[PDB]
């Protein structure tokens, strides 16, 4: 059944699982036409498929050509996501295939279930958590590779950089969700926090800056402050 606060530690046990987030699959800019009507122009998107235990991110880039001549794109986008996730699972060796796939949006359940009929032992699960994976395109290196793509492409990342050398998966996931929650609530401020000290850099092979343990505590504290502030504003409290 559904993944929630109560069974949260299950994410970091030794049963392979993947989160699938489809928020950024179908992306458009809305604009006016010469005649003064409204039209959309699609831009490249991505499926965000993440092992929360290991940090392995399967970033399937969705090139705008996949929508050409198609109708009901927001509905197609769910099925295209399900198709690509099923293709990913089939591409993996048996011992790497997940035992569970957790979809961040309930509308992915039926599309993914139907595409995974060949895998009856892989459980498709919703979640009650409000996870911030939509903010993945606020990570500069992920946004860059999606926008530059000229054809469908899968790009592999570790979204935790080297953090697991020093911290556990639970703590790594907590840091990731705090970072993404901050970038979602106030991207400009979040990004200011992460880069304010020019001496801390992002390794070529990493996504986030190379903070010491002590600097991560300061960073994490700055992100929580950002999130609470915004919240009182949003709600006036």
């Amino acid at each position: 059944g559904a993944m929630n606060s109560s069974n949260y530690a299950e994410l970091f046990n030794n049963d392979i699982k993947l989160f699938v987030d489809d928020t950024n699959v179908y992306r458009v800019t809305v604009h006016k036409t010469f005649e003064g009507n409204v039209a959309t122009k699609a831009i490249n998107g991505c499926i965000f498929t993440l092992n929360p235990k290991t940090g392995h991110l399967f970033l399937k880039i969705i090139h705008t050509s996949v929508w050409a001549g198609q109708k009901r794109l927001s509905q197609l986008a769910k099925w295209k996501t399900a198709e690509e996730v099923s293709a990913l699972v089939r591409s993996l060796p048996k011992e790497e295939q997940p035992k569970q796939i957790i979809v961040t949006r309930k509308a992915m359940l039926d599309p993914l279930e139907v595409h995974m009929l060949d895998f009856p032992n892989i459980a498709i699960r919703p979640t009650e958590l409000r996870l911030p994976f939509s903010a993945a395109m606020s990570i500069d290196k992920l946004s860059d590779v999606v926008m530059k793509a000229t054809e469908p492409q899968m790009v592999l990342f570790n979204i935790y950089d080297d953090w697991l050398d020093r911290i556990s998966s639970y703590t790594a996931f907590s840091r990731l969700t705090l970072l993404l929650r901050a970038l979602k609530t106030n991207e400009e401020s979040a990004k200011m926090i992460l880069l304010s000290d020019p001496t801390i850099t992002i390794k070529s092979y990493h996504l986030w800056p190379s903070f010491t343990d002590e600097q991560w505590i300061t960073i994490e504290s700055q992100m929580r402050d950002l999130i609470l502030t915004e919240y009182g504003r949003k709600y006036n409290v």
Partner: protein
């Protein structure tokens, strides 16, 4: 016109014959039902006065044999049996008719209800859904589960309806996942009609039989089957025009006949709202939609 004699009526019981029903008192001199129309299947059914639990009954066709009812005090129910001695049977019936101890199948001449509810129902198909090959009639009751229910436990006592499952490999062609899930025409027309049922008549027959078992015995798996077979048609974009028109008639008489007070449990809100208002065939069931709106607008 045929007759189903009763040996006796030792326990107080409400007896149904098709859409009609009579209360019989303990040891009342009831000896059966005469003037049963030839040409249709029929169902005689029972609910004991002391246990309003387990409605049960027998599907039969008088053209296939001479059948009677006899109470069994060991198993505690009214049992249908076949009398093979034709002369012994005619003599029993004639005596009971002479003593006027039989109720008459009370069909109004203008009334096509039973025909309309059983138009495609055939005894030979009933006997494949209800497997008990030593009898020519078929026992059904409130508690019997379907093959599909069992998959999700005694198989001899199952209702072997055709399994329909919208998220199954049978329903979904590899490579046509979205297409086949959103437009079930392939599953309806190729898998089910051409493949399994062979023609629309056998499909409607099973649909009608599932409804009748839901209505007369409160059989929940039968209700599930009835709704599934409706939903599979309504969720198909491509259905023969003759099927849609017949479906409207079939469902109209089913909704017309349903007890008004049972709409809460025998009618699945999601299916009916989807079928009448969202599905491909939302505009193809005028009679059924009109009677549903005037008779059960709460459900919608």
């Amino acid at each position: 016109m045929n007759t189903v004699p009763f040996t006796s009526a030792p326990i107080e019981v409400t007896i149904g014959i098709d859409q009609y029903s009579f209360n019989v008192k303990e040891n009342q001199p009831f000896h059966g039902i005469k003037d049963i129309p030839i040409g249709h299947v029929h169902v005689i059914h029972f609910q004991h006065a002391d246990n309003s639990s387990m409605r049960y009954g027998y599907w039969f066709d008088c053209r296939m044999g001479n059948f009677y009812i006899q109470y069994d005090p060991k198993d505690g129910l009214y049992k249908m049996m076949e009398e093979r001695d034709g002369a012994k049977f005619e003599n029993i019936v004639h005596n009971f008719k002479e003593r006027q101890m039989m109720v008459s199948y009370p069909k109004i001449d203008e009334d096509d209800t039973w025909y309309n509810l059983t138009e495609f129902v055939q005894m030979d198909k009933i006997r494949k859904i209800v497997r008990k090959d030593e009898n020519q009639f078929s026992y059904v009751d409130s508690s019997m589960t379907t093959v599909q229910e069992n998959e999700l436990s005694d198989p001899a006592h199952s209702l072997n309806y055709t399994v329909i499952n919208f998220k199954s490999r049978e329903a979904i062609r590899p490579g046509h996942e979205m297409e086949d899930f959103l437009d079930k025409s392939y599953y309806l027309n190729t898998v089910m009609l051409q493949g399994i049922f062979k023609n629309s008549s056998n499909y409607f027959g099973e649909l009608q039989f599932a409804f009748l078992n839901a209505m007369f015995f409160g059989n929940y798996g039968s209700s599930l089957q009835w709704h599934a077979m409706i939903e599979l048609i309504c969720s198909s974009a491509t259905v023969p025009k003759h099927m849609l028109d017949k479906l409207d008639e079939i469902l109209y008489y089913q909704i017309k006949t349903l007890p008004e007070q049972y709409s809460d449990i025998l009618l699945n809100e999601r299916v009916w709202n989807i079928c009448l208002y969202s599905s491909f065939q939302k505009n193809s069931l005028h009679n059924t939609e009109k009677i549903m709106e005037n008779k059960y607008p709460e459900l919608l």
